[PDB]
Amino acid sequence: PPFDFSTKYYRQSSFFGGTTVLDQGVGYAVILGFGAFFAVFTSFLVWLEKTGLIASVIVSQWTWAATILQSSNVAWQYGVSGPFWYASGATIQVLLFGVMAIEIKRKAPNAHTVCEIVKARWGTATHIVFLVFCLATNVVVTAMLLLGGSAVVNALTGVNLYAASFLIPLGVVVYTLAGGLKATFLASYVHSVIVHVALVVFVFLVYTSSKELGSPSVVYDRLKDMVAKSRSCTEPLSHHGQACGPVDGNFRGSYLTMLSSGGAVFGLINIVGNFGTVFVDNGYWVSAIAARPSSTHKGYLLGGLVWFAVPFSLATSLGLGALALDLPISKDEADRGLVPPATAIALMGKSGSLLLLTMLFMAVTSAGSSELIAVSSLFTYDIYRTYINPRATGRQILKISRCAVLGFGCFMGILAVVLNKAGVSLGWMYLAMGVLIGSAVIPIAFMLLWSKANAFGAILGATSGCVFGIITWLTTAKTQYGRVDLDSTGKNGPMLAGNLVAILTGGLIHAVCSLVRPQNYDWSTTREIKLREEKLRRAKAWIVKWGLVFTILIVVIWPVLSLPARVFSRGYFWFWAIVAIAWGTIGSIVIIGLPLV
Ligand SMILES: CC(C)CCC[C@@H](C)[C@H]1CC[C@H]2[C@@H]3CC=C4C[C@@H](OC(=O)CCC(=O)O)CC[C@]4(C)[C@H]3CC[C@]12C
Ligand SMILES: CC(C)CCC[C@@H](C)[C@H]1CC[C@H]2[C@@H]3CC=C4C[C@@H](OC(=O)CCC(=O)O)CC[C@]4(C)[C@H]3CC[C@]12C
Ligand SMILES: CC(C)CCC[C@@H](C)[C@H]1CC[C@H]2[C@@H]3CC=C4C[C@@H](OC(=O)CCC(=O)O)CC[C@]4(C)[C@H]3CC[C@]12C
Ligand SMILES: CC(C)CCC[C@@H](C)[C@H]1CC[C@H]2[C@@H]3CC=C4C[C@@H](OC(=O)CCC(=O)O)CC[C@]4(C)[C@H]3CC[C@]12C
Ligand SMILES: CCCCCCCCCCCCCCCC
Ligand SMILES: CCCCCCCCCCCCCC
């Protein structure tokens, strides 16, 4: 027993190895009745219904299953810089959302999907090409929240892993088929309130009230004893990946430092992934066509500032508390998204597990309902109406919309079962998003903004970038290691190479083939899809001016100013923790109380 506070674990190769905290009945109830319960609740909310609400709406559509599970994964590694580099992809989102919402009103105000603009601007061959890159994004993104949720449910309640994978989408389908087609303005408020209450409780548990970890001076003392050079991590005391001894790639092998190379590489990958999530996902566009930016453009900045605090504070609390407690978490287990449940069980046994399950399944249901209504609209407006029957009455569009939801929900369950059998995990899929669909980001931006891009260059760049990125991503893994499998492929180097190659070459071919043969476009035909510009011109100016300042302040200046601190001292870590606590508390207070006022 090297440590006095972790004697009960002595050596253990894993945290979850039997004797589940809860029983299978709770797991089945959670994975079955959540959709019906909130459907009834939303029906009651609608019945009673008949810059603060907009912020609550923005926050509710940006919290996914990765915001909870993945942000603590890169905190168990790399120490202090992981949560920061994960949360830094928030100021870009508000700028992109504002620009997209402003520019859709002034060039295509009567559209439903992004692929309806591709057919209008360019021809038909490019419509099919980008219709495949849009469905792949939905397939990849939906498969990410079906792996983490199933893993967490199986870890906590002991329910069969292959039964949860198929039964999780059915609850979301039931929720979406009933009220939930954006429902009303109150469901977002309820979701945000629950999420922020859970966040506040978890943050305040580990730094103020817990008996095991009740001070920022205990976490500091325990984090610097794990990376001691006198520590032995041989076979009887530690296993291969188990967070023992100095951290490789960190200055002096410390968890308390901003000088981490792995964290910086992860942030570089995360930027490309966030770029790929905004332009290629049809749910973002669906949310951007229903916005009123000429009068309510100021809520997006508040929404982004409030959303910044969730992946930062939660990962700082639940991620650094697992290292300080000396839990036998393995690398494969931490990859799957099982870091927060372990800390919740260790610190708040049998009561924090239910709270974390509720917080996770709120996001799972909210995000899966949006993914289901990004493909039913795609199918019903870009395939059925355009090619199979181009003369359709309303009663015949509502049947197709309802059938597409069932079809996608039933297909994704089988896909999730297959992926769980094959051993794929969240975190491997999170990093690989930009390699696959990163080549169609710049063509779509050119379609929305640039007036010289043409059809042929778009197809050429989109098709070439994916192939080149995949080739580079596989060849780097083959060259730098001895094999091509799920272990060597999911590393920072190959993933960074694939991401950069995929994103960069798709915007260079399109920008070269268009400067030779420009297609001067006035967006006349996109405005005919089946004052006022002064306000839209003053909203865009405000968004551009006030969105860049915070992006520069957060993504650039703040990490630069923290490098001279080298290894954090007791007094700088106090400030670092107090910043997170204050940010989380103030954001929760603003988003819970102000909309009432
Ligand atoms: C704005 C954010 C999201 C990205 C900014 C990009 C660059 C400013 C970063 C990203 C990756 C960083 C690199 C990651 C790893 C290293 C290795 C590092 O080498 C060492 O000192 C380790 C070698 C040893 O000591 O044995 C030198 C800095 C460098 C090149 C870093 C320099 C700064 C880089 C290029
Ligand atoms: C084994 C891992 C954990 C560490 C060692 C891997 C990396 C340090 C190396 C391996 C291959 C390298 C990459 C090989 C090729 C490229 C493509 C290149 O991308 C371009 O800009 C392409 C040109 C363009 O199209 O504009 C940029 C450098 C990069 C990412 C290299 C960056 C450094 C990488 C990722
Ligand atoms: C645009 C140009 C003109 C200025 C850019 C400003 C910063 C990006 C530079 C200026 C001074 C740099 C610092 C100069 C010295 C160091 C000490 C250095 O510490 C060590 O690794 C040495 C300690 C040791 O190894 O014993 C860490 C980087 C840091 C903070 C540098 C980080 C980057 C800084 C802040
Ligand atoms: C002996 C030498 C070769 C190495 C050791 C000296 C530096 C590493 C230290 C010593 C004093 C430090 C300075 C003490 C006070 C300031 C003022 C401070 O300036 C402000 O921004 C003031 C606030 C404002 O007016 O906006 C910025 C940090 C700085 C330059 C510090 C930067 C780091 C310095 C130069
Ligand atoms: C002593 C063992 C090796 C230590 C290597 C530390 C390298 C840290 C470099 C990463 C710093 C990136 C800062 C980026 C800020 C924008
Ligand atoms: C062994 C010590 C290595 C220290 C390397 C520090 C590198 C810092 C780079 C900062 C780049 C900032 C770009 C804006």
Domains of the chain (ranges plus CATH)?
A: 51-426+536-593 (1.20.1730.10), 427-530 (no CATH)
DSSP state of 563: G
Measured by CA distance, the residue closest to atom 19 of ligand 2 is: 501
Q: Which two tokens stand for residue 53?
A: 């609400």
Distance from the CA of 565 to the center of ligand 4, in angstroms?
Answer: 12
Residue 432 to residue 417: CA distance in whole angstroms: 19
Q: For the purposes of burial, counting CB atoms within 10 Å of the CB of 163, is it exposed (0-12), middle (13-18) or buried (19 or more)?
A: middle
* Number of helices and strands in the chain (H, E): 28, 0
- Asked whether 259 lines ligand 5 (CB < 6 A), one says yes
Residue 423 to residue 434: CA distance in whole angstroms: 21
- Asked whether 560 lines ligand 3 (CB < 6 A), one says yes
Distance from the CA of 252 to the center of ligand 5, in angstroms?
Answer: 10
Q: Which two tokens stand for residue 560?
A: 């630069």
Q: Which two tokens stand for residue 541?
A: 């100016």
Q: What type of residue sits at position 549?
A: V
Measured by CA distance, the residue closest to atom 2 of ligand 2 is: 493
Distance from the CA of 78 to the center of ligand 2, in angstroms?
Answer: 21
- Asked whether 553 lines ligand 3 (CB < 6 A), one says no
Strand partners, 320: none
Q: After which residues is the chain broken (C to N over 2.5 A)?
A: 10, 50, 530
- Please provide residue 481's backbone torsions phi and psi, each rounded to the nearest 5 degrees: -140, -165
Residue 117 to residue 142: CA distance in whole angstroms: 24
Residue 161 to residue 31: CA distance in whole angstroms: 12
Do 80 and 437 touch, CB atoms closer than 8 A?
A: no
309-324 and 216-223 helices, crossing angle to 10°: 60
